From a paper:
Our approach was applied prospectively to identify putative binding sites across medically relevant proteins (ranging from highly structured to intrinsically disordered) for a total of approximately 300 sequences. The relevance of our results was further confirmed by X-ray crystallography and molecular dynamics simulations. These sequences represent potential new binding sites within the 14-3-3 interactome (e.g., relating to Alzheimer's disease as the binding to tau is not the new part), and provide opportunities to investigate their functional relevance. This includes an ‘open’ binding mode, where peptides bend out of the 14-3-3 pocket, an ‘extended’ binding mode, in which peptides occupy the entire 14-3-3 pocket, and peptides featuring a disordered C-terminus.
These ‘central hub’ proteins hold a key role in cellular signaling networks, as they are known to interact with over 1200 protein clients, and are involved in pathways related to metabolism, apoptosis, cell signaling and tumor development. In this work, we developed and validated a deep learning approach for predicting putative protein–protein interaction sites between 14-3-3 proteins and phosphorylated client proteins.
Residue numbers in the entry:
A (entry chain P), D (entry chain P): 241 to 249
B (entry chain A), C (entry chain A): -4 to 231
């Protein structure tokens, strides 16, 4: 992967 | 503005239609209109607002990264000089991104945050404030950059303090806040050890509270926990 | 318009950057600006114009189909009546799509087609005229629909007549024209047998000319031929 | 598949 941030529904 | 004549319920209905159609610029305009009616937002409505602007700014961020990379390549030694066009177009995209961020920050300041009394709403909005200052930080240069970073940090911290006092360690909003503040530390504030510490502690405290959850709540929490794990795997 | 002050070469450079960034609305505005400089377009420039508007109208078409489907479901018996919002938003998207189509058709009429003397350029532009009238046909209702369909058909026919006289059966532009006119016949003009006949004859005549091609040209032609085959497989 | 039309480079 790369870094991930919070998903949006 | 242009949504001033449309009913609040009609704006929310159309936001949902625009989500289905993947028309996120429309979705954002409808939800801006709904916010400007001046009533507090429900949990579902807050999610629509977040989905809309995240998709708009995400498109801009991706485009900016592409253009910034081309620009940086052109400013290497032995690069044939091709004129001002790359910088000009990168600045155009950058200005449009800054404008979207400023619109969101404007909505939070006038007056979503001050009217948010419950922890679930206040933490949501303060996380969003942190996020949109962080997106501004990604494109900022110099002294502006320092104040923007401090603004993001301050918003995230305020959110963390509330979430720790008022929400369980498995709450999805609390988990997503911690995920994003950890990325802030790693990518923006040049504090990789703080990033790793925050992600680890957040993961371990959620793990120990999973036993309290229903099957559906368990699924929601473990999804975000896996994102913390994925970042930690990259970073260590 | 707003691109009136930018050099033609700068507009083309920025169109290429916008393609890389997947910023197709920008790409289309840059290429409209380039056309409005009044010089004929090169083969590469024609392709940029086509890429830009195809991606813009493609987004609109997809959204319109989603909304039309929801609308049609709401107008079934035993459907709870939810007010005017679905129809309103579908009409908004429809009007924006019609506007893009009208912009493209405007560019072709003022003055790309009349200044196109070579077969490769004239066929390209006439195919595009057919395509954008066909996109208008997809959303049209009634008597407007009949004249729009005739306009599409007439443009496609003129292109076919030139391409048959002036281009080899393996030429990609000729193949893509025939592919799209065949879909026109099947989906718009309610002539499935004409569609199937056109696709079959086009495929077989290209097959018999492949021996004349270089490895690279062979790859270009066989890619479009496979699209004809895929449609024929669906239709028969 | 569904129907296909000509791709754009
Ligand atoms: Ca009202
Ligand atoms: Ca309140
Ligand atoms: Ca000039
Ligand atoms: Ca000419
Ligand atoms: Cl620009
Ligand atoms: Cl509307
Ligand atoms: Mg700037
Ligand atoms: Mg209409």
């Amino acid at each position: 992967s790369r870094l991930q941030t919070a998903p949006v529904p | 503005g242009a949504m001033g004549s449309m009913e609040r319920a009609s704006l929310i209905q159309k936001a949902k239609l625009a989500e289905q159609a993947e028309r996120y610029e429309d979705m954002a305009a409808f939800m801006k209109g709904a916010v400007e009616k001046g009533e507090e937002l429900s949990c579902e409505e807050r999610n629509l607002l977040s989905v809309a602007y995240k998709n708009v700014v995400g498109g801009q961020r991706a485009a900016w990264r592409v253009l910034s990379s081309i620009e940086q390549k052109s400013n290497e030694e032995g690069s044939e000089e091709k004129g001002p066009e790359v910088r000009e177009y990168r600045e155009k995209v950058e200005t449009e991104l800054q404008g979207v961020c400023d619109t969101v920050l404007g909505l939070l300041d006038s007056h979503l945050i001050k009217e948010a009394g419950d922890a679930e709403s206040r933490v949501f909005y303060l996380k969003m404030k942190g996020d949109y200052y962080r997106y501004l930080a990604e494109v900022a240069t110099g002294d502006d950059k320092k104040r923007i970073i401090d603004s993001a940090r301050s918003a995230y911290q305020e959110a963390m303090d509330i979430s720790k006092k008022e929400m369980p360690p498995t709450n999805p909003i609390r988990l997503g806040l911690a995920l994003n503040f950890s990325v802030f530390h790693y990518e923006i504030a040049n504090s990789p050890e703080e990033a790793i510490s925050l992600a680890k502690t957040t993961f371990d405290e959620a793990m120990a509270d999973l036993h309290t959850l229903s099957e559906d709540s368990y699924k929601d929490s473990t999804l975000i926990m896996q994102l913390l794990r994925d970042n930690l795997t990259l970073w260590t």
